[PDB]
Design a protein around this ligand. Sequence first.
Ligand SMILES: [Mg+2]
Lengths: 163, 276, 82, 167
Amino acid sequence: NRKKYGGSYSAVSGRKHIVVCGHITLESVSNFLKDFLHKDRDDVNVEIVFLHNISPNLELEALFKRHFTQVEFYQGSVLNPHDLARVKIESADACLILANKYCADPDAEDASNIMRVISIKNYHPKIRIITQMLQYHNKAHLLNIPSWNWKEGDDAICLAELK
Amino acid sequence: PCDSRGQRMWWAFLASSMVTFFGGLFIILLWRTLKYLWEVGWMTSVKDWAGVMISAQTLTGRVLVVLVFALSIGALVIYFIDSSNPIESCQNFYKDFTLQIDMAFNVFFLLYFGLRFIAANDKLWFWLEVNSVVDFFTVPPVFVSVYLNRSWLGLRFLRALRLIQFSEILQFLNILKTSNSIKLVNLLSIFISTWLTAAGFIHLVENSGDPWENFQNNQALTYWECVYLLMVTMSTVGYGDVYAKTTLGRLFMVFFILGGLAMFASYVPEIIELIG
Amino acid sequence: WLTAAGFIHLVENSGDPWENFQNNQALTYWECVYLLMVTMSTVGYGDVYAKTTLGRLFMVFFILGGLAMFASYVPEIIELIG
Amino acid sequence: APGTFAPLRALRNLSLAGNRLARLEPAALGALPLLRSLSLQDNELAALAPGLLGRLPALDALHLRGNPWGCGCALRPLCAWLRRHPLPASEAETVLCVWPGRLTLSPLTAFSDAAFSHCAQPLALRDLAVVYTLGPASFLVSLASCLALGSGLTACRARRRRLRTAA
Ligand SMILES: [Mg+2]
């Protein structure tokens, strides 16, 4: 009985790293990685750090293996301040919360997402957060958070609104 | 001439490997304690380059990975061939063809170890990996062997533990993707590596009797007989036609039953089910 | 069971070719059937066993695929009969 | 049994010929300072173990005909004795190797030191340090070589990229 993915990310000078959390799954991570690391984009070295409570399966572990230098994974819960300190939210360039687009109750998923963003804001208010919202009113709920300020960069992507 | 051995000097190779491993540990821990008590980075640049090399992210990386696969198989075959020779012998480097191939293999493995060390994030936990350990106890003995013109078949069976890092190799090359196939290759690699490594250790301890008896407990077991003995043992069959007679062989059997019978009983049915 | 016993019978009665057939064990077919039952049942008395290289090789490769087959088939057959 | 001959302090000539003694141990003979000759002819002694002849200072005549002498390094201390205790030619011609191979039925007195230079020499003080230092030194050299190659390649790539970014 052991935690194989327990560890602390190490900040690298001159290299921006972003943290990805929320709904982490083989398909979602594959789509995010093929969009983020596309050749047509300008050459910028950004280190992706995935934070998720459920340990990855063999397919997801292999997918992380192909992106050996590009990405990193750390098993933890977004709620814990210690886990957030492990992935270096303080030095992170951005934090991205993915969402389960296909869920039994969209309000419950929005509640989990507002949970996660409130946790990140509580640990570190300055950090910029890009999230996905299934319902439009919950975006207005997001605006109620004190540190949710758009000027420095803070984005809520409402899927219903944009669709 | 012939009959080149009358005494034993295994401690040379053993101490060379041991001092390499333990000096690495001491230097790393001393650096840690000394630090505790006090552009974009060229160290970071070389670390990233080595990380790209270790993976099959480039054509040269794929070539390196395929070469690692092939030369691990080749070094295992070399150990198999050399298993028939006596435990200690004297041979000439520039007149024998197997030592030159083994030297080339070990030079490649040393350079690959250097690349892996450069690419590693945590140096301490990299020093304690199984691949690093089998690199510590396999290459320095071969260098000592070529220097002294004297070959001792010692921890060469540890080369079989290089067979474990094969599922990761196939995952780097994008060949191995689905979870079932990854699980199959993992189980097969672990099972066969453990089987062959335990068989090699039994072969070494039986052919070289326990030291406190002045090496008078030789059983003269060929490697295939030791493989068959391990199969019969961890399969729980236990014929009794072949068994370990030395104290060290019996000790390893006692401590290997606990971890090997469970491994067999949990791996073989799962492998059969997955192939089915 | 019968096919494996027959293969052991043929191999043991005809010693490995590279030894010029000098490794005869002279096992009857019934002895080979008994040996196979003792083996794949995991009992392993050791009074009867294969001594040739080919016989030992086949026994090693048959243990893996036969012990599991015995352990999966015998209880199921007993349950179905009951 | 070791210590069988120990109390016999005044032995001069001891005969063990025509026997089935497969191996003779140094502790079997014990300390026999006055032993002047030994007889071991027509036996099954494959080779004499080291340290057997070290406890017989006065051993001047020794008979070794008709013995299964396996001419290897195991009898290195034996022939070295024969070089300093020459045998009569009639006896010398009968003392031969027994092992099938390169040295079959070759007289033991025909083997010189250079013929057994490949044998295990006593531990030295130079090679003792070389074997201890070969491992870590080679690992450090490999690590430094990989680091230097990576640094050079990365510097070359960066220089090529920043000088030819617009090109
Ligand atoms: Mg990294």
